[PDB]
Amino acid sequence: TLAARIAISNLHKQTTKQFSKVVEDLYRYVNAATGKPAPMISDDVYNIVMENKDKLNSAIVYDRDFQYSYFGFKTLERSYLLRINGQVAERPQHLIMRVALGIHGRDIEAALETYNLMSLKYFTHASPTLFNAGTPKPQMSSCFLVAMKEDSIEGIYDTLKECALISKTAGGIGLHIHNIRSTGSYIAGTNGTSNGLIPMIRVFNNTARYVDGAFALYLEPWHADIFDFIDIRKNHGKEEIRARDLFPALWIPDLFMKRVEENGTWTLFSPTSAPGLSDCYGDEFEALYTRYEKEGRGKTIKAQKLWYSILEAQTETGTPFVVYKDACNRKSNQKNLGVIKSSNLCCEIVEYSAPDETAVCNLASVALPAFIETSEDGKTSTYNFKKLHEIAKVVTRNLNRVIDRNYYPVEEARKSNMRHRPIALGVQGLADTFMLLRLPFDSEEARLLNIQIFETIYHASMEASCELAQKDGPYETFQGSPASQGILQFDMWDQKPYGMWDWDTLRKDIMKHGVRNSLTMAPMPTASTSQILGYNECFEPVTSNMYSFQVVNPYLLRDLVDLGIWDEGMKQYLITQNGSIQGLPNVPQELKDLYKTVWEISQKTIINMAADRSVYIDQSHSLNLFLRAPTMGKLTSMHFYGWKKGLKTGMYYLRTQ
Amino acid sequence: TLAARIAISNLHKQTTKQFSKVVEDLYRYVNAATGKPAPMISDDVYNIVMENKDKLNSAIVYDRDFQYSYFGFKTLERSYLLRINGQVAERPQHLIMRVALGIHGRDIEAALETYNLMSLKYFTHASPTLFNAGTPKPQMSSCFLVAMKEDSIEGIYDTLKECALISKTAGGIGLHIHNIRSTGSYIAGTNGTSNGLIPMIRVFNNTARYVDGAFALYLEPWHADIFDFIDIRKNHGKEEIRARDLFPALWIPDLFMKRVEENGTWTLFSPTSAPGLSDCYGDEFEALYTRYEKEGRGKTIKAQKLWYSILEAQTETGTPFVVYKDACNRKSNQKNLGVIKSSNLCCEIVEYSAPDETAVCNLASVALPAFIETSEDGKTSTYNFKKLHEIAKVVTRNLNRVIDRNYYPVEEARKSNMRHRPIALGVQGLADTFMLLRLPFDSEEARLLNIQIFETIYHASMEASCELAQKDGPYETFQGSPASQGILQFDMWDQKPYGMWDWDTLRKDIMKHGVRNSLTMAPMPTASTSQILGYNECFEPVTSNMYSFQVVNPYLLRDLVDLGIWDEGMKQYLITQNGSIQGLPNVPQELKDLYKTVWEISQKTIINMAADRSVYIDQSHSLNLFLRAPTMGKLTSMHFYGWKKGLKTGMYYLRTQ
């Protein structure tokens, strides 16, 4: 762990110190191999730096470069810090300043503040923002939700064209394909027999390979090609019938879940024969689905045949993902726009898309542990909910600026983002926060900290967003939204807020002034950006207390040494048992309870905590499920338990073994 | 061979006899399985039949249905005659009448005449015309020459979209890709390194598989990806580096051929580094190529390294095809349009294409044997060049009507066809004609018959086309064409016409009145339509005197029986020696000479005959090469011999073993 001083320290001195000078170099860079100028800074951001070089250079506390962990820094080193010629040109602080300015433009105040909070590791922005902010083509946004334009060669290939343009600049795509004809449907244009979804999937998999880049595909389980669709990632099967890079997601209506429970029938349709199904939900969906069912427009099967197949795919491949169409639509502030037809690659975003609107993910995350405080007389940590609420207001504002200063690879993405202005704050180091505060993940304390943390972020972002609506008007589409009627997220869960913040006032202001953002919260994966800040992925508990390159949970070993039981007889068994400390001869019960692995935490608790926090989530959140010795019945009750909690995302991956 | 009476005769009576009634049924057909009306006749063509039913029904000589050979009829039975419900609804005569009307509309005279000449087997139209003429979406045209629109994701995917729309309705595509960036070129849009042509080819191969459909790809041999390009059909090699359905074609400039001969250097370029090369030819091409070469913009190699690789691919796969860019451009009447960048899938069409013009093949073929005449006192056959000239005038007119009444799957194809109005007559049963007239293919007689036959077809079509220019104006683009200056095809070969027809008069009329067609002649493969009429493929000699299902050359065995040597000791050896009669103990020398196989005919003779006839070919023609025990040197001198004759298509397939 001391190797990180020398790693930073040495590459601290292979680098120009004056920030403006690094900008100069990057601004000026030329591709020696081709003699083309390759500016790595934008005209806009360059001029700003020059017109402000003293304020900017002397704001930068270069000491903060040691605020980065072991491989934390090496992650930045590897892929984030801009390189002049194979060599790292930016210091970490330059990256942050560039990003700060890239977000904030002329607003030097805002820029400076974001520089500070970021550099002190209070929050961060998504990877694309960190790569691209402040650069000639500033694509700051991660993923994109794409509609399949129309069920025809023209619509398919325009969609394919769109995904190629998007996939160029990388970034994730969630594509919904409910409207595409199934295997054997009549073709007007020449002769009949379509060959279905798979051959078309195959075109998308090929086009993705060509340009890159992961691709998520969204499908309702009444589609006639559903059985093949869920095996898109299985090994054996057939030859010309899959794809090694696409992630299948189910977009499940309630009726399906019920049909399974009741051990009844389920009907598969081609959309050509059963038009409109993906364009309604809840009671209206069921009225139309049943009618189509009685009119014998499909092929009836046993709901449990399908259900068992879903379970099998998941057991073997960890997919398909499961997201609940009706929870998503019933409990969304975008419900005035139309029916939402999919989530994203990571299962947190639930935003509206259409042939001409490609929804965009605008993401940043808050470092939950940075609000822990010893404060007040003695050895006791508290959590500063005022400082959290504050940071969340800052990040809300940033992400609005990102909306405006983002480069959009396709016009559909610009239409959607400008029009509905959705935002997606998330979090990292929930697990850390718990451990720092000495709270087991399953503790009644952790349960209550979960709720409060999320209440304050939702409260903060809605307040900050209302503030922006006063300055700049509501988003275009605000009129007739749940929020415009004073129905906020938790209201749609038929609940009362935990009440740490005053919701009445905010609700009164919202009804009065609007909000700038149709949506605000989507706790995401953050795999990469939470390695940068040295934290556990997001809102999940730790998967191990050991990482590979042989590092132990910093809070765990500290404790071991304070009790002086930390030795080699111990070091050995930590490796011995996939980073578990349960069943360790000389380890205090308070430690075993605190440093439980996610394989040791009740999934019922996890679903509950996800359900608790869900009432403050505008959108959804990426709920991975972890099963030890997985059985059909165990998987079945976990899906159904989540389903009945009203979750939108019942499952992201199924991680097993 | 008597089984064909019963095959026709029986299916002659499973079929309504009144032509109008079959049209009625076809007009009225409904897809029982879906309850959608599936009209197999167009509104337009239906009304015409009804308004003319007596004239039409009583014009039809149903006896002509026995004018069809053994498997000749069974080819029609299999794929051409329209089917009501899995069952054959059209008789052959109905097919011809439908096609006739489908071409001729209200012009009942023209329709009736075409019905007669077709039914008497004087000529026929291409397969798509026979399938689709007279139907709701009358796509009567075979192939399409497509330009790659631009070297960018947008241009690539628009082209891909175009090919998908075209490939839907089937029909061949010749796509030229000279302008696409090569492996390792800088990409502005994000980071550099393109991955080249193969990955992009792969996208096209995938999109072709999805919709169908053969695909021809055209490339100049200075493209930096040329080595991989020519192996697109090789077996071993690598994994992610080919395609099992695309046919690679070289578009060879003279300079390449010279560099090989001189055993010098050849330079590979990415088009990004060497812009414009595909947009010039001849001296201008060489001036620009050399300049780029001296400016060190490419990678220099030995011309013979490449050349040897070409030869290897051809030896193993029969490809790539070879078409000579400069012969094609120098000797084309479309030279006023711009530089022609490719031929078609079958190597006969040389028409101009561009991002907004997709050239179209409008094909029909004349049955050369149908003009043989015993005429004048005794046992002597002559050839009626007056009756040929006549039929060729009829077919020229048809193909103009096809231009106008064709359905175009994409707008680019409509733009090109309407604007330049190119036509493509061909032939079948050259070999038959020779054999019927007792002329060995290598005879001085056959050589001279070749020339005359082609002089009369070119003369006929140009005359007929001039006639149409008087009635309806020249094509839009005629002004400033070789033909407008009185430079006809043979003039561009620096030759005098053989002079059987009067060219002066015609040339005088053309200069005076124009022509309706930019181009007229493209002797094509005709594999399928020449089975319908019972003839050897086209302008090639017979490949065997036996076919598989054990049939012998009708002219050969007749002769054997007239000499009474036809027995079982003979029948056996015909199978014995891949249908060769050379080296047969008791077979007259006059037979051996007459019934030579294409493996027994001097390829120098074939090239010569192709060169002779080429001076009357507006476009090109599909010259297959046949090599017994193939060596590099033998292949080399055959390419170069053709090359120096000035051929446009030096090679279609290389057929070997």
From Swiss-Prot, chains A, B:
Triggers of expression: Cell cycle-regulated with highest activity in S phase. Moderately induced by DNA-damage.
Cross-link Glycyl lysine isopeptide (Lys-Gly) (interchain with G-Cter in ubiquitin) placement: 305
Any one cellular-component term (Gene Ontology): ribonucleoside-diphosphate reductase complex
Binding site for GDP: 127, 142, 344, 348, 526-529
Important for hydrogen atom transfer, annotated site positions: 143, 361
The keyword Protein biosynthesis is assigned to this record: no
GO biological process terms held by the UniProt record: deoxyribonucleotide biosynthetic process
Entry superkingdom: Eukaryota
Active-site residue numbers: 344 (proton acceptor), 346 (cysteine radical intermediate), 348 (proton acceptor)
Catalytic activity: a 2'-deoxyribonucleoside 5'-diphosphate + [thioredoxin]-disulfide + H2O = a ribonucleoside 5'-diphosphate + [thioredoxin]-dithiol
Temperature-activity note from the record: Optimum temperature is 30 degrees Celsius.
Keywords, alphabetical: Allosteric enzyme, ATP-binding, Cytoplasm, Deoxyribonucleotide synthesis, Disulfide bond, Isopeptide bond, Nucleotide-binding, Oxidoreductase, Phosphoprotein, Ubl conjugation
Cystines in this chain: 143-361
Assigned EC number: 1.17.4.1
UniProt modified residues of type Phosphoserine: 152
Inhibition and activation profile: Under complex allosteric control mediated by deoxynucleoside triphosphates and ATP binding to separate specificity and activation sites on the R1 subunit. The type of nucleotide bound at the specificity site determines substrate preference. It seems probable that ATP makes the enzyme reduce CDP and UDP, dGTP favors ADP reduction and dTTP favors GDP reduction. Stimulated by ATP and inhibited by dATP binding to the activity site. Inhibited by SML1.
Annotated family: Belongs to the ribonucleoside diphosphate reductase large chain family.
Note: Two distinct regulatory sites have been defined: the specificity site, which controls substrate specificity, and the activity site which regulates overall catalytic activity. A substrate-binding catalytic site, located on R1, is formed only in the presence of the second subunit R2. Present with 293000 molecules/cell in log phase SD medium.
Subunit structure as annotated in this protein's UniProt entry: Heterotetramer of two large (R1) and two small (R2) subunits. S.cerevisiae has two different R1 subunits (RNR1 and RNR3) and two different R2 subunits (RNR2 and RNR4). The functional form of the small subunits is a RNR2-RNR4 heterodimer, where RNR2 provides the iron-radical center and RNR4 is required for proper folding of RNR2 and assembly with the large subunits. Under normal growth conditions, the active form of the large subunits is a homodimer of the constitutively expressed RNR1.
Protein name in the entry: Ribonucleoside-diphosphate reductase large chain 1
Portion of the parent chain present: 76 to 746 of 888
